[PDB]
């Protein structure tokens, strides 16, 4: 809603959708005819409007790829990435380590 | 009117499924083009952060207008259904004229 509003979504569609590409390239031809240009413009409007919800889902998927734990691991804001099924073992041995370390550190 | 009676019909005939409220569409329950029976839920919407389903009124073949994930307004068009059209076909012929205008009370 901040960085990928409709204007940028349309800009994306300009280079993806074959139908919208074909229509946009056809309208780019100089001096075809008045009637043909009007028809092409209406076709473009209908196609670009029709494709908004799908490219919206694409957009939020794109944004979701920025919120993954791989990024957090590269930036150093988490310590590690764990698997759920084996988390019990990991956290057991980790907590054991940390408690023993606390004892020696207090000394 | 006085001692004479006139009865007007309230349009409910086009058999278009409509959202009863504002909100958001989450998903559809059945396939686009599948047959639905009256009383069967065809869609899932959420308003109020509280989910409310949507039962079909008539039995017929449903085609959806809005794509999954969409803003809903009360009385909006969500999904049309094809029926066997028992009656009430083309009850429009929208009047385009002018109402009586003789007096004015302008002194």
UniProtKB/Swiss-Prot annotation, chain B:
Biotinyl-binding domain residues are 8-82
Name where it's found: Cytoplasm, Cytosol
Post-translational modification note? The biotin cofactor is covalently attached to the central biotinyl-binding domain and is required for the catalytic activity.
**Positions of post-translational N6-biotinyllysine modification:** 49
* Tissue expression profile of the protein: Expressed in brain, placenta, skeletal muscle, renal, pancreatic and adipose tissues; expressed at low level in pulmonary tissue; not detected in the liver.
Q: Where are the Phosphoserine residues found in this chain?
A: 98
Instruction: Report the function annotation for this chain.
Output: Cytosolic enzyme that catalyzes the carboxylation of acetyl-CoA to malonyl-CoA, the first and rate-limiting step of de novo fatty acid biosynthesis. This is a 2 steps reaction starting with the ATP-dependent carboxylation of the biotin carried by the biotin carboxyl carrier (BCC) domain followed by the transfer of the carboxyl group from carboxylated biotin to acetyl-CoA.
Give the multimer and partner information. Answer: Monomer, homodimer, and homotetramer. Can form filamentous polymers. Interacts in its inactive phosphorylated form with the BRCT domains of BRCA1 which prevents ACACA dephosphorylation and inhibits lipid synthesis. Interacts with MID1IP1; interaction with MID1IP1 promotes oligomerization and increases its activity.
In the record's own words, the domains note is: Consists of an N-terminal biotin carboxylation/carboxylase (BC) domain that catalyzes the ATP-dependent transient carboxylation of the biotin covalently attached to the central biotinyl-binding/biotin carboxyl carrier (BCC) domain. The C-terminal carboxyl transferase (CT) domain catalyzes the transfer of the carboxyl group from carboxylated biotin to acetyl-CoA to produce malonyl-CoA.
Disease in which the protein is involved: Acetyl-CoA carboxylase-alpha deficiency: An autosomal recessive inborn error of de novo fatty acid synthesis associated with severe brain damage, persistent myopathy and poor growth.
Protein name per the record? Acetyl-CoA carboxylase 1
Species assigned in the record: Homo sapiens
User: Intact protein stretch covered?
Assistant: 738 to 844 of 2346
